[PDB]
Amino acid sequence: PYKGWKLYFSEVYSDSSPLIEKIQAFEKFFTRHIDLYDKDEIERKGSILVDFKELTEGGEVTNLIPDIATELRDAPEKTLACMGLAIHQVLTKDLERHAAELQAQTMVNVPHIHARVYNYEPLTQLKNVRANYYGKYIALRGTVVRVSNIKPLCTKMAFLCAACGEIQSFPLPDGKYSLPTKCPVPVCRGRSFTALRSSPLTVTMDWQSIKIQELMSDDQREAGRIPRTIECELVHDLVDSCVPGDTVTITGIVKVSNANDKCMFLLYIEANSISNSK
């Protein structure tokens, strides 16, 4: 009933899991506001931009998401996955109905849709970003200083279990090729999988790394303070959205980087959205 379930979740689909409640919550939101977005631009770019003020809007459309501000902040990777599958389920239902009338007068293949929330608040200044912010969703605003070149990045790798024939979409931590340890089905644990590099469950998107420097008051906050910087990882439609010197607003997830000048603990922002003025 959920085509594209493995495009967002590595778990096995079960109607008893708490994910169903969250997914259907955004599904009600996206069905009522489907005319507010361009369904053609969503499918082409593979993403959707949602205003955070629309989600925190009081009323009837946001009836099933009263705690979106806390869940997105403390569990962004789980909230965006449900929000992404929801819009994918809304689009796959709106297109299967369109293809139903064409047949009378049904394989609709909707690709992965990145759920991208912008205009998130409160804004977090870079100096107050501590190590405790790991896994949290925040919004930054700084100057672009460096923009690396675009490179491919294998985010997920499909694996076929030789026991039951199930194909899982296994994420790679840092693009490092790794193998699953157990089959996600609750019956068998084959522990032996074959890589399906040509499978659609194997994700490969354009990757770009940019560096952001905080907005420093050149005289007020210059009383012995150095401008802090942080790396931001753009992907897919966010790639090539800013040049060095631009002032951008970035939302995303704080994560730990894994790659005298060598410090062994660096935080970066997995960019979920970027807004460039110029």
Query: Closer CB to Zn ion, residue 160 or residue 239?
Result: 160
Query: Closer CB to Zn ion, residue 187 or residue 263?
Result: 187
Cα–Cα distance, 220 to 209 (Å, whole number): 30
Contacts of residue 219, Cβ cutoff 8 Å, sequence gap at least 6: none
Count of residues in contact with Zn ion, rule CB under 5 A: 7
Question: What residue type is assigned to position 36 of the chain?
Answer: L
Query: Closer CB to Zn ion, residue 36 or residue 188?
Result: 188
190 belongs to the binding site for Zn ion (CB under 5 A)? yes
- The secondary element (H helix, E strand) that includes residue 209 is strand 204-214
Cα–Cα distance, 199 to 206 (Å, whole number): 18
Query: Closer CB to Zn ion, residue 6 or residue 236?
Result: 6
Cα–Cα distance, 214 to 230 (Å, whole number): 9
Q: Candidates 188, 243, 256, 266: give the one binding Zn ion (CB under 5 A).
A: 188
179 belongs to the binding site for Zn ion (CB under 5 A)? no
**Min dist. Cβ of residue 191 to Zn ion (A):** 9
Cα–Cα distance, 164 to 184 (Å, whole number): 11
Query: Closer CB to Zn ion, residue 142 or residue 184?
Result: 184
Instruction: Check: CB of residue 125 under 8 Å from CB of residue 227.
Output: no
**Min dist. Cβ of residue 190 to Zn ion (A):** 4
Q: Candidates 36, 99, 164, 179: give the one binding Zn ion (CB under 5 A).
A: 164
Query: Closer CB to Zn ion, residue 147 or residue 161?
Result: 161
Q: Candidates 138, 183, 201, 232: give the one binding Zn ion (CB under 5 A).
A: 183
Query: Closer CB to Zn ion, residue 5 or residue 52?
Result: 5
Across the strands, what pairs with 196?
158
Contact stretch for Zn ion (CB under 5 A) within 98-106, 150-158, 176-184, 224-232: 176-184
**Min dist. Cβ of residue 75 to Zn ion (A):** 28
CB atoms within 10 A of CB 16: 6
Query: Closer CB to Zn ion, residue 75 or residue 167?
Result: 167
* Torsion sign (Cα): 195, 196, 200, 205: positive
**Min dist. Cβ of residue 161 to Zn ion (A):** 3
Contacts of residue 185, Cβ cutoff 8 Å, sequence gap at least 6: 12, 161, 164, 166
**Min dist. Cβ of residue 186 to Zn ion (A):** 10
158 belongs to the binding site for Zn ion (CB under 5 A)? no
Q: Candidates 23, 68, 161, 271: give the one binding Zn ion (CB under 5 A).
A: 161
12 belongs to the binding site for Zn ion (CB under 5 A)? no
Cα–Cα distance, 262 to 9 (Å, whole number): 36
Instruction: Check: CB of residue 175 under 8 Å from CB of residue 259.
Output: no
Identify the CA nearest to 161 among candidates 141, 181, 135. 181
Contact stretch for Zn ion (CB under 5 A) within 35-43, 45-53, 72-80, 164-172: 164-172
Cα–Cα distance, 65 to 82 (Å, whole number): 12
**Binding positions for Zn ion, rule: CB under 5 A:** 161, 163-164, 166, 183, 188, 190
